[PDB]
Design a protein around this ligand. Structure first.
Ligand code: SAH
Ligand code: SAH
Ligand code: QPO
Ligand code: QPO
Ligand code: CL
Ligand code: CL
Ligand code: NA
Lengths: 319, 319
């Protein structure tokens, strides 16, 4: 039935995890057709059992079959690359920590102590727990780095970064966005703020250990906040934007860059943000409402299409 | 994108789990339209956050939205009933035990110790582990009871059980099949063989502690083996059927009743059977092959329709 297969949606994620996490998918580079008999001899993977997984992956549209051999579909070519954001995504998606968070989601809907399903499962909020877990921190940071790399070219296209001199990326993680921007727009002052136990090192990037809930370093003419606000409540989002308004002078600009809620796209990410952070997906007008409450005004708006989501690009200045 | 949402398939299962496992779905009986504000007052569920889950459940087709109220779809009426097989399926599908089995699935494809992904995660094979885990045993046995209840009427319709005098259901679990058959077909000796520490009790039914890998007791004119062979390898399946042939005389009949592999249905259950049991789904032809190797021959075959799967009904006798 359609209902029992909907209940069993998890099996699709688990099948992809087995295929990608083992590195079996790396044998499918460059659109090659793989003979599972040959793959078994060199890799040691069970012929009969991996062939049955491949049949399920064909059903899913991950693999295509010809002459009893399997290739990756064009869409799923990314699974052959272990450095692809999709590879890091599947490693996190059904990991034990995420699974235990999802099992607390039901109970989390009845509590009002401001603890996410993740915190209920782990005893600390997501980013505080990641401080003590290499697997989660390295894979999450790697995922954010890959998606940052993918948006750079379009971001440099739609907005002229050459007009700015002092640039701070707030919650910029490993700093991939400004590292790539600094290679195209050379000779500016580039800074990245995040929570660092050990400072990253990269040519002409000033890495700052900080906390955007407490304070944003003042004196920059361009601030960037990319994919941060969806990890936070309305009240915490207003606090962050208030801290920007206090850091900014009349000539300063804040680029609020975020995946945006659109009716046509899936609500699944909105639920994941609830589970991990008590966060949420927001529309443009919802972001604008928070910014207006924080004492910021929209000067410019654009849409950036990415394969996986639409993005809101909102240029903010103090009222 | 389609691929990121395919990777995020687990979120669909986890959303349904939060909705059903909490008992929130029991407020949606008889296709009623629910005001989430009203539900929040009564149940104590967070209005805003549950409304967002309901938006995702509408996207999935689990809920239907009208006038900002939500009802279960006709197909998903079963979610309002905590005694439905779908309710028990949901409880097991993304439980910690299954999650940890799925996380070993990739690694299991590179080993030939004969340990399932489940055994690699939990240290014992499925049914041996269930002996010591009430959560898995109670919910698994409840699931099997519910799916047995749904097929009883169709079995009674397509086979004359009244022609037999002594009937043994082998691996019959809680004995629901014969409990229900005994209500319609009177004046028979009914027995159920399974792995029991303490014997179940039912007015019409004699429960026997046994092991179908070791021996099947003689002196029954009808034997039944329903939904057992998919938990076993081809070699173990032939051993089970050989033990039937040794227990049976020329006048004995064996009803082999099993979900059957048809090309038009999902391979997802085939992969679950690999993970839990190193089992598999089989076609009619594949079942007949095993029976023939065990020294049994097909007297009668029928296809039984169930909502979630087609079934093979095979009457077997000794050569
Ligand atoms: N209180 C806090 N102060 C500063 N950074 C924080 C923070 N809480 C979380 N973060 C950081 O916020 C980031 C969210 S993920 C976004 C990373 C990057 N801006 C990108 O778009 O790819 C993480 O790097 C996390 O470490
Ligand atoms: N070695 C063994 N001997 C007997 N029963 C066994 C067994 N190993 C597993 N079983 C039983 O096999 C059953 C598989 S599930 C099928 C239950 C029932 N026939 C139905 O169709 O609903 C379980 O009840 C399990 O306890
Ligand atoms: C597995 O758990 C995840 C937690 C996540 O936070 C994310 C993702 C996955 C993710 O795939 C993602 C993709 C694109 C842009 C993003 O911002 C994310 C993101 O944030
Ligand atoms: C979640 O774990 C499961 C393990 C299972 O073994 C099953 C099921 C679920 C199951 O939903 C099911 C449905 C119909 C007929 C069946 O035989 C099964 C079955 O066997
Ligand atoms: Cl600086
Ligand atoms: Cl309301
Ligand atoms: Na500061």
């Amino acid at each position: 039935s359609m209902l029992t297969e909907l209940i069993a949606s998890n099996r699709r994620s688990a099948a992809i995890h087995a295929f990608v996490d083992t590195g079996l998918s790396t044998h499918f580079k460059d659109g090659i057709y793989v003979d599972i008999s040959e793959l078994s001899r060199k890799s040691g993977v069970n012929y009969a059992r991996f062939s049955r997984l491949c049949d399920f992956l064909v059903e899913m549209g991950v693999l295509v079959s010809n002459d009893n051999k399997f290739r990756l579909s064009d869409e799923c070519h990314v699974f052959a690359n272990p450095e692809s954001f999709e590879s890091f995504m599947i490693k996190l998606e059904i990991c034990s920590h995420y699974s235990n968070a999802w099992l607390m989601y039901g109970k989390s809907l009845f509590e009002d102590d401001g603890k996410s399903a993740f915190e209920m499962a782990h005893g600390r909020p997501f980013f505080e727990y990641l401080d003590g877990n290499k697997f989660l921190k390295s894979n999450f940071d790697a995922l954010m780095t890959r998606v940052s790399n993918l948006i750079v070219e379009k971001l440099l296209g739609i907005y002229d970064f050459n007009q700015h001199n002092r640039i701070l990326d707030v919650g910029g993680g490993e700093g991939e966005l400004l590292v790539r921007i600094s290679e195209k727009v050379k000779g500016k002052h580039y800074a990245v703020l995040d929570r660092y136990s050990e400072l990253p090192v990269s040519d002409n990037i000033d890495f700052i250990n900080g906390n955007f809930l407490n304070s944003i370093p003042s004196g920059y003419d361009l601030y960037i906040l990319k994919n941060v606000l969806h990890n936070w409540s309305d009240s915490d989002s207003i606090l962050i934007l208030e801290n920007f308004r206090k850091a900014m002078d009349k000539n300063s600009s804040l680029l609020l860059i975020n995946m945006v809620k659109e009716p046509e796209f899936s609500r699944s990410f909105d639920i994941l943000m609830d589970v991990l952070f008590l966060g949420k997906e927001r529309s443009f007008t919802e972001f604008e409402y928070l910014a207006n409450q924080a004492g910021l005004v929209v000067q410019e708006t654009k849409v950036i299409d990415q394969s996986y989501s639409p993005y809101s690009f909102i240029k903010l200045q103090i009222k």
